Design a protein around this ligand. Structure first.
Ligand code: BW8
Length: 288
C-alpha cells in the first residue's frame, strides 16, 4: 500500500520559541519554521533531562495517531522533533484560539452571529464523524470547548491538549460513574453551550451535586432565559440536544445522523453572511 513518513524537524529550525498559555502549564509553545516560513505550535512534556525512552514512545504514539487522522477539520500535524535535547510535536498554529474563549469572553466578542455558530457546530460534527468512521474507530472521549480550535477564518480544528491519554466533568455521560456513545454526549452539551453562551450548571458549586444530578437524569436547563426564543431553528436544535444527551446510550444518535439533519439547517443561511460574521468579531476586537 501507499505509506508516507512523518517529517522529522530539527530543533534548531524552530525560531522565536515562546510559551503559550494553554493546556497544562509549560506543555504548549509557539515558534516559526526557519525554512518553511510559517508559524507553528509545539506540544511537549515539561522540560527536563534526561528524556526517558518510555517518554519518547508516548509522544510518538500521539503523533502517529494524529498523523493517521489527517482530515479537513482535524488539527494538521506538520512533523515531530525527536533529539536528545528536545522532544515535541509540531502542528499548524491556530491564530484565533479556542471555542472556550469565543463563547465566554463577552467583552472581546460582544456579539457572535448565528450563522457562524451553526457552521462551528457543523464542522465539529464533521471532524468527529470522520474519527468514528476510521478502522479501528477513533474515539475522542475529551470533547470540550478548550479542545475546539479556530483557524484564520474561524474554521473548526479538533485537537487534544491532554497528555495522560497516551468543571471538567460536565461533558461526561452519566454511565461513566469501546463505548462509542461518549462523544455524542459531550457534543450535546457543547451545542447547548454554544447556543446559550452560559456555563453549564452555573449555580452548582460542588461537582458531586452535578454528578449525582446527571445520574438521575438532570441536564442543563432549557428555558426562555437560557435559550431565547429568537434562536433560528430553535425547536429542531433542542430535539438534537435532548436526543444527544439521552440517559440511555442506545437512544443517542450517531454523528452521521446529526450531519444528515444539520445539512438542511445550514443551507438556509446565505453564503456571504458567514464572511460578514467573521469580519464583525475581528472589527470589535480591533478597538480592544
Ligand atoms: C492560539 N493557538 C494555539 O495556542 C494553538 C496551540 C496548539 O497546540 C497544540 C494543541 C494540540 C496538539 N495535539 C493534538 O491535538 N493531538 C491529537 C491527538 C489525537 C487526536 S484523535 C481524538 C482524540 O484522541 O482526542 C486529536 F484529535 C488530537 C498539539 F500537538 C499542539 C495548536 C494550535 N494552536
Amino acid at each position: 500500500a501507499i505509506c508516507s513518513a512523518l517529517p522529522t524537524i530539527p530543533y534548531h529550525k524552530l525560531a522565536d520559541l515562546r510559551y503559550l498559555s494553554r493546556g497544562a502549564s509549560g506543555t504548549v509553545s509557539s515558534a516559526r519554521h526557519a525554512d518553511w516560513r510559517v508559524q507553528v505550535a509545539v506540544k511537549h512534556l515539561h522540560i527536563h533531562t534526561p528524556l526517558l525512552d518510555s517518554e519518547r514512545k508516548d509522544v510518538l504514539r500521539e503523533a502517529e495517531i494524529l498523523h493517521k487522522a489527517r482530515f479537513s477539520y482535524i488539527l494538521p500535524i506538520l512533523g515531530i522533533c525527536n533529539e536528545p535535547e528536545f522532544l515535541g510535536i509540531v502542528t499548524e498554529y491556530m491564530p484565533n484560539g479556542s471555542l472556550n474563549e469565543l463563547l465566554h469572553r463577552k467583552t472581546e466578542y460582544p456579539d457572535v452571529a448565528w450563522p457562524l455558530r451553526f457552521r462551528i457546530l457543523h464542522e465539529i460534527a464533521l471532524g468527529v464523524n470522520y474519527l468514528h468512521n476510521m478502522t479501528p474507530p477513533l474515539l475522542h472521549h475529551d470533547l470540550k470547548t478548550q479542545n475546539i480550535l479556530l483557524d484564520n477564518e474561524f474554521h473548526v480544528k479538533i485537537a487534544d491538549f491532554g497528555l495522560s491519554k497516551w468543571g471538567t466533568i460536565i461533558y461526561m455521560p452519566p454511565e461513566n460513574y469501546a463505548s462509542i456513545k461518549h462523544d455524542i454526549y459531550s457534543y450535546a452539551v457543547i451545542t447547548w453551550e454554544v447556543l446559550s453562551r452560559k456555563q453549564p450548571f452555573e449555580d452548582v458549586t460542588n461537582p458531586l451535586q452535578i454528578m449525582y444530578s446527571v445520574s438521575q437524569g438532570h441536564r442543563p436547563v432549557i428555558n426562555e432565559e437560557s435559550l431565547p426564543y429568537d434562536i433560528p431553528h430553535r425547536a429542531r436544535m433542542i430535539s438534537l440536544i435532548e436526543s444527544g444527551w439521552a440517559q440511555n446510550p442506545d437512544e443517542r444518535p450517531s454523528f452521521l445522523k446529526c450531519l444528515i439533519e444539520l445539512e438542511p439547517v445550514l443551507r438556509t443561511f446565505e453564503e456571504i453572511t458567514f464572511l460578514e460574521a467573521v469580519i464583525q468579531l475581528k472589527k470589535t476586537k480591533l478597538q480592544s
